[PDB]
Amino acid sequence: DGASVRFDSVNLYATFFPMAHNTASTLEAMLRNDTNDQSFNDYLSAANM
Amino acid sequence: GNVYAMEINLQANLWKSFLYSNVALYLPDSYKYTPANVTLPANTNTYEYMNGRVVAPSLVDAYINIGARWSLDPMDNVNPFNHHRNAGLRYRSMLLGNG
Amino acid sequence: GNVYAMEINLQANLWKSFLYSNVALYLPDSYKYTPANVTLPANTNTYEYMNGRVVAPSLVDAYINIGARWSLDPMDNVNPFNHHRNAGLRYRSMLLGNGRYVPFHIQVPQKFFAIKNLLLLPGSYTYEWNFRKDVNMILQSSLGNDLRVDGASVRFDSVNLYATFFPMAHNTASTLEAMLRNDTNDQSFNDYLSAANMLYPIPAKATNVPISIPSRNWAAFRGWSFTRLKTKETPSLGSGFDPYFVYSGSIPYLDGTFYLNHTFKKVSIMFDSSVSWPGNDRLLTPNEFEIKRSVDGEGYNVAQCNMTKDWFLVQMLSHYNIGYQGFHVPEGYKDRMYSFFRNFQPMSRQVVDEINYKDYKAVTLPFQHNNSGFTGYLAPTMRQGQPYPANFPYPLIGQTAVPSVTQKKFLCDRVMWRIPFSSNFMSMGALTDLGQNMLYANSAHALDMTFEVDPMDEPTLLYLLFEVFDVVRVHQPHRGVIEAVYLRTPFSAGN
Amino acid sequence: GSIPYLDGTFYLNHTFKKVSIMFDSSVSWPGNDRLLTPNEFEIKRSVDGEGYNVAQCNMTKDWFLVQMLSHYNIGYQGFHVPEGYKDRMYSFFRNFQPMSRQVVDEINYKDYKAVTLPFQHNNSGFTGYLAPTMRQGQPYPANFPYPLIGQTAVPSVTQKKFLCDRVMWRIPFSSNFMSMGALTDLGQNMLYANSAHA
Amino acid sequence: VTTDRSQRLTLRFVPVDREDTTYSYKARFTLAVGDNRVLDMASTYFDIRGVLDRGPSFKPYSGTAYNSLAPKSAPNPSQWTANEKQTGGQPKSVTQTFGSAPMGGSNITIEGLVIGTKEEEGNATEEIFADKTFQPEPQVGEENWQETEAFYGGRALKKDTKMKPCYGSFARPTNEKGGQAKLKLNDQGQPTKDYDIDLAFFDTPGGTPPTGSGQQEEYKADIVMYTENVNLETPDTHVVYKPGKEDESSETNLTQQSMPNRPNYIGFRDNFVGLMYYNSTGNMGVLAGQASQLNAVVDLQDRNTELSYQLLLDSLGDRTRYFSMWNSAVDSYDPDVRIIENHGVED
Amino acid sequence: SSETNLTQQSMPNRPNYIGFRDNFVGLMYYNSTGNMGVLAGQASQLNAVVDLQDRNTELSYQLLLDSLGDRTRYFSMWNSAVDSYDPDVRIIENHGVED
Amino acid sequence: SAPMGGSNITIEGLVIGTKEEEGNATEEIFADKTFQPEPQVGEENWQETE
Amino acid sequence: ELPNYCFPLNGTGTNSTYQGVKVKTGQDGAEETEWDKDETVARQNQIAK
Amino acid sequence: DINFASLAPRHGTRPFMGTWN
């Protein structure tokens, strides 16, 4: 039925909380330790047939 | 004598125009037909087919299932979101404008 | 020249067809008539009568009270829940489908307070209940006609008791039983209403209803609730059947649809025929709860109607603890469907000043005209007459606006009026501070109460609830044993 | 159109009749005599001798219980409307719609005739003939539909159904069907899969 | 938390005893709470099955199902008698008719309206006459506003079928193609295997053809009406006006007019209130330990269980949500119908 | 052009709103192992995504938003405006007309 | 327009009805011009003819 | 999509007048003028073509 | 979906507003 699409550009944006550097450098040093691995779980959490 | 006049049931028309536009036009293709001397494309998944096929207004007329809450039986299996009256798609379609 | 055409006003017709179907047909029978050469049945409680009587569309026409929120004055005393536009009954009537002939299959729950939340321990219990086949009691109709005449009936094909059991680990359930059989752990319950119910007759056109209860104790009394009922809209519960319950609309006394609360003017309370209550100079009218006033020299009205400063305060205190330190809208979760500010509707209108407007004339309905030529003569039927300047209603607006007088009223359509027996009218706790005073917990007072009310022209009841405690404790000491102990108090009900 | 599998617009849930679960081709689940029909989740029934329907449609007592238990922990100790913050757009009670209608009894109504659409008339003279176009014909008594009300009401049969338009049916592998925690009590039973069940 | 034992979730008990009567039904169950269980009575309810008849007073809709678009005071096409009578020497007592003829066609004969044709031999082309038992259909007429054919036909009600205004008129179909005519039974009461249908034929009046060209042979049918008797009813309307006491077919009775019957929804009450007896000690419910046999209920007349339960639900939840299982759907009204709020109209 | 053609009659074309899907579903590839996305530390080539065919990210996100907030509120930045239908069109509810 | 139908017209106006009087003396009831004919009154039906 | 119409009070609208006729005496089925006026039926029936 | 959140927070402030120890 005649529809079409063209992409002229795709850009990635990122926003940063402007954290005090002595604080961010402390947070990084805590989050790099293997005790503090971030973990996530898919919300649906299922195998799909 | 009294002034010359003609009489109209406005309420029946406001209800029939609701049922025909919101339900008769959405009945599956097997309930529709192609008018006399009109030529449609063979690809049934195309706008000229979906728009060209006529539906008898007697299907889902003002008295159909009168008195009851009853989804029509051919409509239970019809995708209800593929309808011109869904606010989410209207909004998403109008957000890009009208052209 | 321009194409031949004829003109319709759609927007005026979409409004008239609303007013006539939604209000004109519901005006009381004394505003209706029987057409020429039509024969109705003599039983007015029947569909052929309620349907056969015609109503002139000039009553509640497009201009009626134009510009104002005003419930029509005959309609305030008409049951608003007996109306074809109430969604709850439309839903309930459509849930069964569109035919008159309907097999049914329904799950009726248990409501009795001593049972409805109870946990039964192991044993065999005989359970019985008794059920009505009376269509005026078990069905409802949107007109309220007498279904025992108008041909309804019901048959039960079977009735089965279902029980659903949490599949508890047996060593846990056998422990739970052994704890709940101990007399420390009696389950106990409280009827949510927790009141003693009196119905007193008010004769047709009586404006005063004086009532009393003789010398008795008032230990743990909570206060009063009261409201007004029609006698024909109230079945007798004292019998297997009530053959004079010739009506099937809503039953406010059973279902909570109370709609005559605006008809009270004042209530006064007098213990021992001397000890006025609340006394102690509390109110702006210390010895009477003046619910509303018809003329107001001092300025004791509130809220832009004719409810008083006293009464609005007593209601906002008893429902919401609001009035001391200032009024505001109660937060929505403390303002339920039976609360006050949810239901309270104040109103004002203006009327032509029939005394001081010297060019006034008293045109009755048959002589009034507006839309003549374009409208039926006193009937919902073919247009009659000629176009002509309208003679009704007099204008209240613009440059020729007529001298006018104000009328003010309120409606309150699901409440029932409350007076807490609490020293400041607030709820500080379920057992009040007056119900455990030095006086009322010790000495048996008599009580005299009296009400002043709008006259009805049909028989009505004062429905008076003495709010009490109404409590049960349930002991299950052995397999298949129930002991149950009741105390209502005050108005304790057994020996 | 919508893509239910991608966007969540599921609209064919009313089409299931029953589901049965069977481990090792012998160990029926939930088994243990639990349901009124112990070996099958009978979602709905077209005829009900024992009276196992609910909610004034044809959904069963067993299924309605399982859905109210799995979504809200409600079935044991009585049914009520779930509190609004725990009844989201994809929840059960938010979407469950029971329905009933009456139809002419084509078998027991002896004066019945089967008039098909081209021959039905109602609003003739004031309506287009089988099309959304100009009015045709003459005013005449309508021949359809048969009246189900008033004194001349026609013998009739009831039809019952329900819709559920954004839900997807659930069966928690939990010993009482409730959500007591995200790792269920059967899920830390059956580690026992040394016999590895099929 | 949960037993592994083979044990039901839901038990259904049929009555051990029952007492159906003039205006009540009673039933007794043995509510066996088995061992190593506990029962919450909030789980329990009565699963009633039965039948209603709502009576002729039920009407679950506003307006009418039948001919709803018809102008009120418009009659069905119909017949009467003794209309024009001019004496010298007789009150003539003719049949008389009003109607319309929407089915256009090519010719009219003893067999009625020619609606079509077929080739036969090219010379022998057969005239296809309408099958009177269902053609001409009242819902078929000229395809567009411009046309007018040479010959016309339609249907009308025979004089024996008493007038009703078209708005609300129904008559049951008497064949599979939706014809409405009564079967004849007039010699003896068995159906005569044929329909009460007659052709009536018409021409322009001799006062409108030119003089001399309206005598001898000049009369010629150019309209035909398939007149019939039908099973006429008005299931959902009533006559609000008619010009005399006479119920019969007559020229003035064409001006009858009807109004739809007032809507009257019937169903069970909110929460099924009124269905069980409560606070009614002649008819009290029972819960007793089967050995002890003494009733634990102990209800009273000055208690009101049904109102107490109505209030309780509004404190526990949101009464604006309907729930079919308990028939919970609270009574209401439209607030713009209770308090009129007359802002006029945007005209 | 002819005298009979004066009687032609027209009907408006069926409404057909077009726009991007709710939450832009379908625009990015997910759970589709021909066209998988990448997030990797630029030094060391191991993709951290590791997606699968039997996973459904788009439905998972649609469900998550209904648990985190109110889907009845449209939001143009993420094109969030949930699909619906008019309930009076899904279940006809024929109460007749006030005429 | 003139919606009020009647039996005769005279200097006294429109004859809107009649009464027996003596059977020979039947009086013609003329419309009271101060309010009749009412503009909201006219022929009952479309078959219309006085 | 669906046209609303406004109609005369009597339903049929502008009726023309007609008179009842009958076939002469069953002699022919040789149609055209072999009809005659039916005296059993009113000379002014109201009908719309 | 047994509404599958399960997340870390259990938190609070000083005599108004936070720096940690």
Residue numbers in the entry:
A (entry chain E): 601 to 649
B (entry chain E): 452 to 550
C (entry chain D): 452 to 946
D (entry chain E): 700 to 897
E (entry chain D): 56 to 402
F (entry chain E): 304 to 402
G (entry chain F): 155 to 204
H (entry chain F): 403 to 451
Article, verbatim:
Human adenoviruses (HAdV) are double stranded DNA viruses with non-enveloped icosahedral capsids. Adenoviruses have a conserved icosahedral capsid structure, consisting of three major proteins: hexon, penton base and fiber proteins. Hexon protein, the most abundant of the capsid, forms 240 trimeric capsomeres making up the facets of the icosahedron. Minor proteins, protein (p)IIIa, pIX, pVIII and pVI, play a structural role in the capsid alongside the major proteins.
HAdV-D10 has low seroprevalence across human populations making it a compelling candidate for development as a therapeutic vector. Single particle analysis using icosahedral symmetry led to the calculation of a capsid reconstruction at 3.3 Å resolution using a total of 5,524 capsid particles. The structure of the HAdV-D10 capsid is largely similar to previously published mastadenovirus structures with global pseudo-icosahedral symmetry with a T=25 capsid. The sharply resolved map supported the assembly of models for hexon, penton, pIX, pVIII, pIIIa and pVI. The full length, 949 amino acid, atomic model could be built for hexon protein. The overall architecture of hexon protein closely matches HAdV-C5 and HAdV-D26 with root mean square deviations (RSMD) of 1.158 Å and 2.448 Å respectively. A copy of the penton base is found at each of the twelve vertices. The penton base (coloured in cyan in [Fig fig1]) is highly conserved compared to HAdV-C5 (RMSD 0.762) and HAdV-D26 (RMSD 0.492), and similarly is well resolved except for residues 297-324 which correspond to the loop containing the integrin binding RGD motif ([Fig fig1] and [Fig fig1]). The flexible loop contains an RGD motif that engages with host cellular integrins and corresponds to residues 299-324 in HAdV-D10. In conclusion, we have combined the first whole capsid structure of the HAdV-D10 capsid at 3.3 Å ([Fig fig1] and S1) with the first transcriptomic investigations ([Fig fig4]) of the same virus, revealing unique features and insights into its biology.
